Design a protein around this ligand. Sequence first.
Ligand SMILES: *[C@@H](C)[C@H]1/C(=C/C2=NC(=C\c3[nH]c(C[C@H]4NC(=O)C(C=C)=C4C)c(C)c3CCC(=O)O)/C(CCC(=O)O)=C2C)NC(=O)[C@@H]1C
Ligand SMILES: C=CC1=C(C)[C@@H](Cc2[nH]c(/C=C3N=C(/C=C4\NC(=O)[C@H](C)[C@H]4CC)C(C)=C\3CCC(=O)O)c(CCC(=O)O)c2C)NC1=O
Ligand SMILES: C=CC1=C(C)[C@@H](Cc2[nH]c(/C=C3N=C(/C=C4\NC(=O)[C@H](C)[C@H]4CC)C(C)=C\3CCC(=O)O)c(CCC(=O)O)c2C)NC1=O
Ligand SMILES: C=CC1=C(C)[C@@H](Cc2[nH]c(/C=C3N=C(/C=C4\NC(=O)[C@H](C)[C@H]4CC)C(C)=C\3CCC(=O)O)c(CCC(=O)O)c2C)NC1=O
Ligand SMILES: C=CC1=C(C)[C@@H](Cc2[nH]c(/C=C3N=C(/C=C4\NC(=O)[C@H](C)[C@H]4CC)C(C)=C\3CCC(=O)O)c(CCC(=O)O)c2C)NC1=O
Ligand SMILES: C=CC1=C(C)[C@@H](Cc2[nH]c(/C=C3N=C(/C=C4\NC(=O)[C@H](C)[C@H]4CC)C(C)=C\3CCC(=O)O)c(CCC(=O)O)c2C)NC1=O
Ligand SMILES: C=CC1=C(C)[C@@H](Cc2[nH]c(/C=C3N=C(/C=C4\NC(=O)[C@H](C)[C@H]4CC)C(C)=C\3CCC(=O)O)c(CCC(=O)O)c2C)NC1=O
Ligand SMILES: CCC1=C(C)/C(=C/C2=NC(=C\c3[nH]c(/C=C4\NC(=O)[C@H](C)[C@H]4CC)c(C)c3CCC(=O)O)/C(CCC(=O)O)=C2C)NC1=O
Ligand SMILES: CCC1=C(C)/C(=C/C2=NC(=C\c3[nH]c(/C=C4\NC(=O)[C@H](C)[C@H]4CC)c(C)c3CCC(=O)O)/C(CCC(=O)O)=C2C)NC1=O
Ligand SMILES: CCC1=C(C)/C(=C/C2=NC(=C\c3[nH]c(/C=C4\NC(=O)[C@H](C)[C@H]4CC)c(C)c3CCC(=O)O)/C(CCC(=O)O)=C2C)NC1=O
Ligand SMILES: CCC1=C(C)/C(=C/C2=NC(=C\c3[nH]c(/C=C4\NC(=O)[C@H](C)[C@H]4CC)c(C)c3CCC(=O)O)/C(CCC(=O)O)=C2C)NC1=O
Lengths: 160, 160, 172, 172, 162, 97, 161, 161, 54, 153, 9, 113
Amino acid sequence: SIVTKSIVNADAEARYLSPGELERIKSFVLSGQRRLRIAQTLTENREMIVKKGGQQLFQKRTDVVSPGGNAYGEEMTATCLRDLDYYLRLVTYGIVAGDVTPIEEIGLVGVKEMYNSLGTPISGVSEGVRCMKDVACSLLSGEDSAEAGFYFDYTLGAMQ
Amino acid sequence: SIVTKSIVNADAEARYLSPGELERIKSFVLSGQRRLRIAQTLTENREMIVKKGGQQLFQKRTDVVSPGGNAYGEEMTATCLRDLDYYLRLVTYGIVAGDVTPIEEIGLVGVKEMYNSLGTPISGVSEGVRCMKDVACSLLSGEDSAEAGFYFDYTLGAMQ
Amino acid sequence: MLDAFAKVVAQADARGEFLSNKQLNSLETMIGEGNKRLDIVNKINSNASTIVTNSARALFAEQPQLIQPGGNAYTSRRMAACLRDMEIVLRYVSYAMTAGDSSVLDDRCLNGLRETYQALGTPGTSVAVAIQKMKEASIALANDLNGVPLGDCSSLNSELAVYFDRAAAAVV
Amino acid sequence: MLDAFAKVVAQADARGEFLSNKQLNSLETMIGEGNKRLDIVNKINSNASTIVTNSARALFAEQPQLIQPGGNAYTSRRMAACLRDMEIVLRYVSYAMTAGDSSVLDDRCLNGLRETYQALGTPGTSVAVAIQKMKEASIALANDLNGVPLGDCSSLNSELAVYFDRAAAAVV
Amino acid sequence: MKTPITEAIASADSQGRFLSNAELQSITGRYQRASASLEAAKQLTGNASRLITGAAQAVYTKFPFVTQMPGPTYASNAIGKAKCARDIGYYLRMTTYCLVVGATGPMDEYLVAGLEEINRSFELSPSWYIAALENIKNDHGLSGQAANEANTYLDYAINVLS
Amino acid sequence: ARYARFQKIAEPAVLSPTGTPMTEIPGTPYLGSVGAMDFIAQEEESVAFWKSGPSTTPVNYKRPSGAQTPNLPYNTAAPVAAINEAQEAQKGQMQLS
Amino acid sequence: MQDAITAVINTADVQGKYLDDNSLDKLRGYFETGELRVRAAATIAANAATIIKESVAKALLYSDITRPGGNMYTTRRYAACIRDLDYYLRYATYGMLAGDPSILDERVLNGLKETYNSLGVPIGATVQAIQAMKEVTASLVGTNAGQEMAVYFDYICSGLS
Amino acid sequence: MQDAITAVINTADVQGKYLDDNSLDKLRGYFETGELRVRAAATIAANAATIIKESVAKALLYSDITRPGGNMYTTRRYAACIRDLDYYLRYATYGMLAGDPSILDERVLNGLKETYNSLGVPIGATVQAIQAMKEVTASLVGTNAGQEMAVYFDYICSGLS
Amino acid sequence: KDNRNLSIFNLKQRVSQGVTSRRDQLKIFEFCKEKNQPADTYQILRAIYRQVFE
Amino acid sequence: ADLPPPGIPSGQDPLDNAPLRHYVPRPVETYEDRGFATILPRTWEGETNTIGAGDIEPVTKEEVEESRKVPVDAASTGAFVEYARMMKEERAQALADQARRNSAPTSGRPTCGETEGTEFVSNARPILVDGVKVVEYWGVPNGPVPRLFGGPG
Amino acid sequence: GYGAYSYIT
Amino acid sequence: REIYNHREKLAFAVIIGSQGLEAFIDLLINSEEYEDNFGDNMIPYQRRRIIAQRSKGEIPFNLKTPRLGKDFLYKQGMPQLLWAGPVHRFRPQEQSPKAGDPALFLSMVQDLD
Ligand SMILES: *[C@@H](C)[C@H]1/C(=C/C2=NC(=C\c3[nH]c(C[C@H]4NC(=O)C(C=C)=C4C)c(C)c3CCC(=O)O)/C(CCC(=O)O)=C2C)NC(=O)[C@@H]1C
Ligand SMILES: C=CC1=C(C)[C@@H](Cc2[nH]c(/C=C3N=C(/C=C4\NC(=O)[C@H](C)[C@H]4CC)C(C)=C\3CCC(=O)O)c(CCC(=O)O)c2C)NC1=O
Ligand SMILES: C=CC1=C(C)[C@@H](Cc2[nH]c(/C=C3N=C(/C=C4\NC(=O)[C@H](C)[C@H]4CC)C(C)=C\3CCC(=O)O)c(CCC(=O)O)c2C)NC1=O
Ligand SMILES: C=CC1=C(C)[C@@H](Cc2[nH]c(/C=C3N=C(/C=C4\NC(=O)[C@H](C)[C@H]4CC)C(C)=C\3CCC(=O)O)c(CCC(=O)O)c2C)NC1=O
Ligand SMILES: C=CC1=C(C)[C@@H](Cc2[nH]c(/C=C3N=C(/C=C4\NC(=O)[C@H](C)[C@H]4CC)C(C)=C\3CCC(=O)O)c(CCC(=O)O)c2C)NC1=O
Ligand SMILES: C=CC1=C(C)[C@@H](Cc2[nH]c(/C=C3N=C(/C=C4\NC(=O)[C@H](C)[C@H]4CC)C(C)=C\3CCC(=O)O)c(CCC(=O)O)c2C)NC1=O
Ligand SMILES: C=CC1=C(C)[C@@H](Cc2[nH]c(/C=C3N=C(/C=C4\NC(=O)[C@H](C)[C@H]4CC)C(C)=C\3CCC(=O)O)c(CCC(=O)O)c2C)NC1=O
Ligand SMILES: CCC1=C(C)/C(=C/C2=NC(=C\c3[nH]c(/C=C4\NC(=O)[C@H](C)[C@H]4CC)c(C)c3CCC(=O)O)/C(CCC(=O)O)=C2C)NC1=O
Ligand SMILES: CCC1=C(C)/C(=C/C2=NC(=C\c3[nH]c(/C=C4\NC(=O)[C@H](C)[C@H]4CC)c(C)c3CCC(=O)O)/C(CCC(=O)O)=C2C)NC1=O
Ligand SMILES: CCC1=C(C)/C(=C/C2=NC(=C\c3[nH]c(/C=C4\NC(=O)[C@H](C)[C@H]4CC)c(C)c3CCC(=O)O)/C(CCC(=O)O)=C2C)NC1=O
Ligand SMILES: CCC1=C(C)/C(=C/C2=NC(=C\c3[nH]c(/C=C4\NC(=O)[C@H](C)[C@H]4CC)c(C)c3CCC(=O)O)/C(CCC(=O)O)=C2C)NC1=O
């Protein structure tokens, strides 16, 4: 959450919140209903983003779909789209939080070690999240999908 | 065990073990080879005792395997034979222990509270153990099934 | 025996997956490089005897040891064997230049070569000097602008140099 | 190569004495055992392919490693090769069951086998699991009461088990 | 492995000579047909899973007893269906390897060498696989020279099995 | 090492299932196959994705190298490094725009 | 810590005795088994990643821990989980190759039960994971060395339980 | 508490198994040592008095403890000390004859170090007294049974220390 | 050999006695400019991570 | 010296007059790898390293079963009888006590389940609670309180 | 932290 | 026949290094040794494998020497001890019950008359 990113800051400096920081908190709490519109739209359109982003993923990257691939098989393919659903949900948490702390601590802290322990190529995960970024930018406005799309960009920068 | 029991009584009297008691422990530790044979036979014949005893239980007592009863179903009948396996196993512990202490602390202390918490009629339990007593006395000698059958008798006296 | 394609396929079967599109793009890139590759191998296969002979002349001129009585290249037998061994190493560097992988060159020539030249008493570092001379002659021959349209070929000369350096590294 | 009789004679000549009457009584006893022997070898030689196939099915089911890509027993080549090897060991255990001595099974098959399975990278213990499965199938096949008059085969089953246990002991 | 380059090298190596113009022309021709072969490999890799599932459905519709026959070798268990798509996936993967390599090397060294002893010792039938490869040959949906390539290697596997 | 394997960045030498280090040539430990894939540049190495066009043609020749010519021992087998420095000194580059 | 050798020198030292025939029989035992312990440690060193992957696939696979609210549910807790299996495998190898589980007493089992009961780590699932490493590891190193690794994995399992 | 038999039934029970050949080997071991334990317990029962007198006479008398200001100075404290020695000998016999020191965990060493550090009983002198009872007792029961009683007395001394 | 009464508990305690053996078993990471190996240097860095962040 | 190393003819030495500059020390070669250096079973002495046929001992079906089971002797059985004789009187007392305890209802509020869960857990021990007594030494004797030296001297 | 392990949940 | 010493391997590997495989096998077959013992129509066998009455003799040549030798064993892409992590077994815990479970006894329930 954005609010936390200030209390920890001036806590470690052992002072009260700075005036500059305080203005941002006001700008944050006044920008709230627009954020809840964004996460409302990505909430109620999740099936299109996961399905269509999975289609663009598997069409761009036929490595995983093929036999011997990490995602091959009915159970395996379903899990792959289950993880895309996880990241999509996390992106929505990061939007209402006004910070990627929710995305980082639920999804990104130690992700490389897990997917390397699963044998999953993490570049295919980043291609999947980029596909969901393209679909989610197709479902939103200009400045709106700039904002949400930049949360997706943070997740891409953490995967790569 | 007889050692444990001798120790507990003397300990509570705060004296050394009595002369009569140490003779009892001598007779016990010399009757050891034979006891082992008794539990060896009931160990290696357990499947016939549990199955045949379960057959005589359900044939004598068609209550609990009827629809409506406790042991209705394949799963529930399997749980019922599971418990008869437990007590058959315990009887073997009581035979090598030379005392009912092992049977009493594993199996009997607080049994009625458990089966009343399960909805199980405990008279059916006692009839099951009596059936295994008849099969296990069919598998043994005269004095041998006297002894082992009396351990079964103690578990019947605990259930009733 | 493995070329580039057989190495990619062999690893992809050792894990048992298919080839990704990334791999296929890399293969297509090496194919577009492959005409230049055949040009280098044509230059080497042409002037190879002058490579072996001139490099042996510079070997014996810089090290006058082996032509002298008692030296390792002292007999008609031993000299012919010396020249032919240089022809062997130049032949397999030509092979691995065609294949794009250093597998054929390892498996046929370099693998176990040291144990032999130890087992015969042959100075290995003199062999290494010989292969460095064939590297000099071969690269300076490969960078000739004669008869061929111009272009950029620094990567393939780098690769060829890696093959010769692997030869001199495997005798020493 | 020695059977039981050639072993008795070979020892008695290695000391250079005659055969005592005790030895001859032992030989006559083994002869009276010999029809049961041939019956067991007939049962094994009949159902041998089902022994090897079923034992390989249980091997790959209990150890799913070898059927997977990158596995030792993986390729049609490698599967046929591992599969055939089981047939080899079953063949010589049939031989040593006939001879009554474990000499031919040592001298043709087991002696030097470890150095090969080391030299290929084959896990010995997987081979040992395979041989234990053929021992289970083979003994459970040898104790069939079908077709034959009732008799005691406890000593001969013990002997046969000694041969398979020697095979699994020689790979591991 | 049997690639055209390694046939060239291997022939010149058995002769002990260099790589004269004959072999270089060989490597040229390989470098030309390579492109269409790579496109075919891309599209087979594209729709692998539906080709394998479709092929197994074709085998099951052609031989309906196999799902009904109670056995280890038949595809009646769920394990059996997994071994079914497993094996058809092996054939599809070796075909894509031969498309990439440009010769029949990976099929001849991973698959063709000793196939018969296996199809015998586990009572597997060539006919089931043949029907699988017929459905792969119909439903790959390639076009042009790429389709000629994949039809070439798939037909080659069919003629190995019979 | 697995990261490099799953992502096709490089092949990394790892100890063999037995434990003895995976050598290509049995003389030295931890060798790898060197050809034609070391020389293809990967996009993950470059910071700059934007520049894609090299603007010259490079042409190689031999420069006399003057000083920086490494001292070599006479009548003996020179060390491998010395001859490599001698050839690194004598490399000239022309750039044609 | 101590190996088997150091432990012999400890008992003989702390009695003031010299090395008698018993202690030399113990040192003979260890020196007979040493090379087998070495090659076992070599093979475990080679295949650690696959031991942890196959043991997590056996033991934690198809379980509720993966589902939301289980203790392995996040990426941070998954990575911490497989990290702890790395510790168990590695210290089990040290304990095998020393021939004395004193390492496990000093650097692993101390405070670990208080730690897992503090955090909320399920002990049962941990013990089943360790036993899965025991089965996979015994499958790699074979019968003898699988018995040796079996006593140290069973030592850790007896420590947590 | 538990004896060796109960301990075998504990391990076999807590695995869920029945009695295998290892546990029967342990029961055979106990039943072989049974009579030795019985006569040792008989002899210690016979000569408890003399074990205590001899061990107090070796370990404690004519020192600062029985001199004024020491902890055994008053008659009340003399009798309490001999009393304590009697309990150590008696429960050490129970521990010997059970073959399992669980009794000493339950009924002796629980809270005893807090007791003696509360009152001001010297732990050093107590341990020396117990070892004096160990030597005298081993002298009475002989070599084998003295090793067995040695274990229990050393168990109590390891508990106090 | 008199001490015919020393037993496993007594011996565990006499072995375990003083300041714990970790003193003799601490390894200290010196960065020396003399024996500078890049691999070795990296292991020192990783040891800095393990010391500071446990 | 003696002979020539495993590969070189005595007459011609390849290192004849080699310079010290280009002189490769020859590696030690043994014949340990070769097949003729392996040691065969003696067999002209009376030792053949094959264990088949002779070693196996004839075994009846019954012997195996009797060898599977635990061995029993008369001493052991007779003392089992000696054990059942002494324990005869107290086993009956234990049964009668158990029937008396379970027969009489205490009848209070049941905890879990229905109608059972009263104040005493069924088949609980009176001897665990009653056995361990709290005994002020130099107090009024709650218990027997033996004294080792109490007896007047 | 944003993801916390309560036994309650 | 086994090779006489290391030097034989050396010499014959040169002639198969330059002349190719063809002229090498031409050397072994048109040699005087091969003519002296097989002639024109005989399958090559193992010469003197067993000396006489000794039981062991020598490892069979096919058995003794195999392809993919120890030096070549260590090369990249050899068969691995564990890689693939097949998930074919599904809910395996279902196949092997622990000691406490009924499932076993359920099989006994199906048995019952
Ligand atoms: C354990 C192996 C069996 C068992 C075997 C018995 N076979 C008996 C007699 C017998 N068996 C054969 C068949 C055998 N002799 C041959 O020459 C050939 C093949 C060329 C075979 C496969 C014959 C001919 C005979 C005797 C004649 C007859 O029975 O008509 C046998 C009887 C005792 C004995 O003769 O020593 C036994 C016990 N029987 C068993 O119950 C287990 C399963
Ligand atoms: C059978 C024999 C045989 C050969 C000998 C080659 C000859 C060859 N080279 C090129 C073509 C070429 N050859 C070179 C080579 C280089 N240019 C430079 O400036 C460097 C000096 C030199 C480094 C090796 C280049 C750069 C091209 C053009 C780029 C390319 O086609 O990849 C072409 C393309 C067609 C054309 O240009 O008309 C052909 C056929 N191919 C063959 O089939
Ligand atoms: C006269 C007796 C006699 C034998 C007993 C065999 C033993 C043997 N097996 C192989 C060779 C082989 N043996 C197997 C067998 C195995 N596959 C596995 O998964 C299992 C571990 C194992 C079966 C249980 C395999 C796979 C090969 C080929 C190994 C390889 O090339 O990688 C070889 C090398 C030659 C070859 O490739 O065939 C030899 C000598 N050969 C003989 O002449
Ligand atoms: C490298 C290439 C390669 C292959 C192509 C396969 C081929 C193959 N399949 C099986 C084995 C098998 N293959 C099948 C497959 C079938 N099930 C059916 O219903 C259909 C008829 C058919 C699918 C179309 C089955 C069921 C088995 C197991 C047979 C059995 O155990 O009864 C086996 C024996 C080993 C095993 O059990 O896995 C082999 C070698 N394996 C390889 O290594
Ligand atoms: C160690 C010894 C050593 C040498 C001997 C020189 C040799 C030399 N000269 C040039 C390079 C040059 N040399 C000259 C010289 C010439 N101008 C003319 O009118 C005459 C023909 C000639 C003088 C007599 C010129 C003009 C260049 C630059 C050429 C150009 O860039 O077009 C270069 C290329 C690098 C550069 O541009 O400087 C080199 C290596 N360099 C060395 O390191
Ligand atoms: C360039 C300088 C240079 C040297 C200094 C020599 C040094 C030298 N000496 C020998 C070799 C030898 N050197 C000697 C000499 C000795 N006989 C003895 O009784 C004395 C101890 C000693 C003379 C003082 C002998 C006997 C041999 C042969 C040793 C042998 O074969 O056993 C060899 C091995 C090659 C050979 O056999 O010739 C070499 C390199 N060679 C050189 O190239
Ligand atoms: C397949 C790869 C392959 C190789 C790489 C060679 C390697 C090799 N060289 C020789 C053998 C030889 N090699 C040389 C070469 C040398 N002369 C010198 O002055 C230099 C030190 C050196 C060249 C740089 C000589 C002189 C011999 C003969 C040595 C002798 O007989 O004294 C031999 C023994 C057989 C023979 O006499 O030909 C072998 C195996 N052979 C092969 O099959
Ligand atoms: C909320 C944060 C969070 C995430 C993201 C998460 C992921 C996660 N992914 C898993 C597996 C997996 N995830 C994938 C994903 C993919 N395969 C591909 O090829 C594609 C690139 C990609 C899909 C886009 C696959 C194949 C598996 C299973 C691999 C296997 O079991 O062999 C598992 C293993 C067990 C289980 O799923 O229950 C976890 C815990 N856990 C978390 O707590
Ligand atoms: C060798 C010496 C040693 C060991 C063994 C060790 C264990 C250990 N495990 C920990 C946490 C953990 N351990 C696990 C383990 C598991 N989760 C599962 O579901 C699995 C069933 C199970 C593993 C098999 C998890 C998820 C955490 C993280 C809890 C948290 O902080 O969020 C932590 C807290 C520090 C942290 O990781 O953040 C320690 C200290 N520490 C040591 O110094
Ligand atoms: C303040 C209360 C108090 C008392 C009284 C006390 C007595 C006491 N008397 C002792 C010995 C003794 N006391 C006696 C006394 C006697 N011998 C006879 O024949 C006579 C009847 C009698 C003298 C009148 C003797 C002989 C010993 C030593 C006996 C021996 O060591 O063998 C000892 C043994 C060790 C030592 O003295 O240091 C104590 C502690 N301790 C106390 O704390
Ligand atoms: C003033 C503040 C202060 C005190 C008093 C103090 C005591 C102290 N004594 C120690 C050890 C020790 N102390 C002793 C003491 C004794 N051994 C005997 O047998 C005697 C009976 C007895 C002394 C009368 C011994 C042997 C050790 C070493 C244990 C070991 O580490 O090996 C140690 C551990 C550090 C070390 O010495 O290696 C401390 C810290 N520390 C302090 O900061």
